Design a binder for this molecule. Structure first.
Ligand SMILES: O=C(O)[C@@H]1CCC[C@H]1c1ccc2ncsc2c1
Length: 166
């Protein structure tokens, strides 16, 4: 958990313009959050980047979790191995508003972070899930009470977030 170059937005939310995969390799946090779908199929976005950094070990593991426990629900999560990136990976499903999923579930998605004292995470439901990233940051700030280090890859998005917040 040796985080560096973060900007403290609130008492418990910090932000940095960085690739979460690189942050994970440097810090080796206790928990790295994945922006997952209900079947834990890591095909693109941050899920694909995280899976690729474990050389498909996250996917083999996820396929075994799904065969044994069934799919997650939108707003839910599960804790799996973090492999070479972290001690644990917390897979969290935010709503896919581009597929008509309810934005009210984005609060439920963020409540999962509260079971862990410190997490390295991306913005939920942003990118391919189609929700407004600035709105996503607002729900994170209002919902998460534990210590969360948000890593934002796109510098244009990072600058919009820091401008809207501070
Ligand atoms: O922070 C971002 O720009 C987006 C917002 C939601 C998904 C994030 C993302 C997407 C892809 C990716 N690949 C490596 S780190 C990484 C992070």
């Amino acid at each position: 958990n040796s985080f560096s170059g973060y900007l403290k937005l609130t008492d418990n939310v910090y932000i940095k313009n960085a690739d979460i995969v690189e942050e994970a390799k440097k810090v080796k946090p206790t928990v790295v959050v994945n922006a997952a779908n209900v079947y834990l199929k890591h095909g693109g976005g941050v899920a694909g980047a995280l899976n690729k950094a474990t050389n498909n070990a996250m996917q083999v593991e996820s396929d075994d979790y799904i065969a044994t426990n069934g799919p997650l629900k939108v707003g839910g999560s599960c804790v799996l191995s973090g492999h070479n990136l972290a001690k644990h990976c917390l897979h969290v499903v935010g709503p896919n508003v581009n597929k008509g999923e309810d934005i009210q579930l984005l609060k439920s998605a963020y409540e999962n972070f509260n079971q862990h004292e410190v997490l390295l995470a991306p913005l939920l439901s942003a990118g391919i899930f189609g929700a407004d990233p600035i709105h996503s940051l607002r729900v994170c700030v209002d919902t998460v009470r534990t210590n969360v280090y948000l890593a934002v890859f796109d510098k244009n998005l990072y600058d919009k977030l820091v401008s809207s917040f501070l």
